[PDB]
Amino acid sequence: APFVAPNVQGRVIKESGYNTKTFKPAYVKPKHVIDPNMIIPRQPGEALGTG
Amino acid sequence: AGLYTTYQLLEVQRKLKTLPAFFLQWFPRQINFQEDMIAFDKVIQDVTRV
């Protein structure tokens, strides 16, 4: 607090305000194409020979 | 004595030496198969991508 000789008025004290933060979320979009070149070939569980 | 020395047999000392199983503890799975060959399919899946 300010020391102020009691013979005088007093001292005016300043203030401070405040702030805000604002954010937009980002966007994510992966995809696969699944044409036959991927469906046909033998997958690991398939028996050798026939499948 | 005379004809032959008499004897007492005391019990037989059988040392049966063996090779106890150690490495087979990491091969617990057993497959009996009549096919010509065994086959593995090993897959790497790099799902760590962003």
SS3 readout for A1-51: CCCCCCCCCCCCCCCCCCCCCCCCCCCCCCCCCCCHHHHCCCCCCCCCCCC
Distance CA B26, CA B24 (A): 5
| Alpha carbon of A47: minimum distance to chain B alpha carbons (Å) | 10
| Technique that determined the structure | cryo-EM
Query: Residues in chain B whose beta carbon is closer than 8 A to a beta carbon of chain A?
Result: 39, 41, 43
Residues of B in contact with A44 (CB under 8 A): 41, 43
